[PDB]
Design a protein around this nucleic acid. Structure first.
Lengths: 62, 61, 110, 108
DNA sequence: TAAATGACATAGGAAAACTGAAAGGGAGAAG
DNA sequence: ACTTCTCCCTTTCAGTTTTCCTATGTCATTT
C-alpha cells in the first residue's frame, strides 16, 4: 500500500524520461538539417561578395 | 540453455547501446561544428559587406 | 548492543573472511573487494548481496521476519556510508564486468 | 529578550501569520509544519519560513550578510523540538508530493 | 536460428539534505 | 565579584535518505 504506488511514480517518470530523450534527439536532428542548409546559402553569399573584391579591385585600380 | 541466452542478449543490448550513444555523440559534435561554421560565415559576410561598401563608395564612386 | 561503526565492522568481516567474494586482494590488508552484481540478473542469489544485507541486519535496518527483503536499498545505504568515509576510496569499478562483478576499495591517510 | 521555543512557536501558531503553519485541532493540541525537502527545485525559502523565523528570532540569521542557510535553520528547529519531551511527531508527510509536512502533537 | 533494437520496469549513482543520538556552547541561576 | 552548575537549545557524529538522473536486465520485435 506504500511501495506498490511508489513504483508507479517511478515508471511514469521513466516513461516521461525515455520519451523526452527521444524528442531532444528529434529537435537535435532538425537542427543539423537547418544548419547545413542555412550554412551552404551563406558560403555562396560569401563567394558572391568575394568575387566583387576581385572585381572592384580591377575597377578601382584603374 | 536459458542462462546463456540471457547472458548473450544482455551483452548485445550493451553492444547496441554503446553504438547508439556514439552516434548521438557523433551527431552533437557535428551539430557544434555547423553552428560554429555557421558562425564564421555570418561574420565573414559582415567583414566583406563592409569591405565592399568601404572599398566601393570611397575609392571609385 | 551498541551500533557497530561501519569501518571496524567491515574490517572484521574481512579478516574472518566468511562471506564469499568479500576479502582483501592485497595481503597487507590495504585493498579489499566487494561482490557487486546488478540486482536485475535473474541469476542472483543473496551471495551477491551478503555484505549489503549483513550490514543492514547489523544496524537493525533489516530484521528478518519483520521485513521484506530490499536488495537495492541494502546496497544503496552500504555504498553511501562508505562514500563519505574519507580514509577509504574506490580504486577500481569492475561493477559491470561480465564474469565476477565487483568494486575494489582501498585505504589512505592524508 | 532571548525567546524560549515553545511559547514562541505557539504564538506563531495563534497569529497564523505564516502559511502551512497552524493548528489542525480545535483544542489547539495538534499543529502542522511545512516540511518540503530542500532538494526539490520547486523549493525556495517559503517552505522554510518558520525555520527561518526561529533563526532570526534567536538572533541567528541577521538578514545582513548572514548568507541564508536553509539547511541549518531547519535542522536546528527540528532538533530543538525533538528534545522537548511533551511534544512529539504524529505524522511524517515530509515526502508528500503535493503538501510536504510533518504534524506534531502535544502529549495531553 | 542468431544478432539488433525498441520498450519497460527496475536498479544504480553523485550531491546534498536530512536524522536521531549524543556531546557542545552559553547566559543566567546557584552557591 | 568569582566559580560552578543548569537549563535550553545548538553542533557534530556517523550514517541514512531524497532528488534528480542515468544505466541495465529482460522481454518482445526486428532484421
Amino acid at each position: 500500500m506504500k511501495a506498490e504506488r511508489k513504483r508507479m511514480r517511478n515508471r511514469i517518470a521513466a516513461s516521461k524520461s525515455r520519451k523526452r530523450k527521444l524528442e531532444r534527439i528529434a529537435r537535435l536532428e532538425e537542427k543539423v538539417k537547418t544548419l547545413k542548409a542555412q550554412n551552404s546559402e551563406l558560403a555562396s553569399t560569401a563567394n558572391m561578395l568575394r568575387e566583387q573584391v576581385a572585381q572592384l579591385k580591377q575597377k578601382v585600380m584603374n | 540453455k536459458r542462462r546463456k541466452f540471457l547472458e548473450r542478449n544482455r551483452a548485445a543490448a550493451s553492444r547496441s547501446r554503446q553504438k547508439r550513444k556514439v552516434w548521438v555523440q557523433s551527431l552533437e559534435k557535428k551539430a557544434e561544428d555547423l553552428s560554429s561554421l555557421n558562425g564564421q560565415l555570418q561574420s565573414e559576410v559582415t567583414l566583406l559587406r563592409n569591405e565592399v561598401a568601404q572599398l566601393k563608395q570611397l575609392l571609385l564612386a | 548492543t551498541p551500533k557497530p561503526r561501519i569501518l571496524p565492522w567491515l574490517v572484521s568481516q574481512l579478516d574472518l573472511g566468511q562471506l564469499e567474494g568479500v576479502a582483501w586482494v592485497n595481503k597487507s590488508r590495504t585493498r579489499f573487494r566487494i561482490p557487486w552484481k546488478h540486482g536485475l540478473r535473474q541469476d542472483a542469489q543473496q551471495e551477491d548481496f551478503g555484505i549489503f544485507q549483513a550490514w543492514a541486519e547489523a544496524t537493525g535496518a533489516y530484521v528478518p521476519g519483520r521485513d521484506k527483503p530490499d536488495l537495492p536499498t541494502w546496497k544503496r545505504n552500504f555504498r553511501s556510508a562508505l562514500n563519505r568515509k574519507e580514509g577509504l576510496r574506490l580504486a577500481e569499478d569492475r561493477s559491470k564486468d561480465p564474469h565476477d562483478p565487483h568494486k575494489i576499495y582501498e585505504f589512505v591517510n592524508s
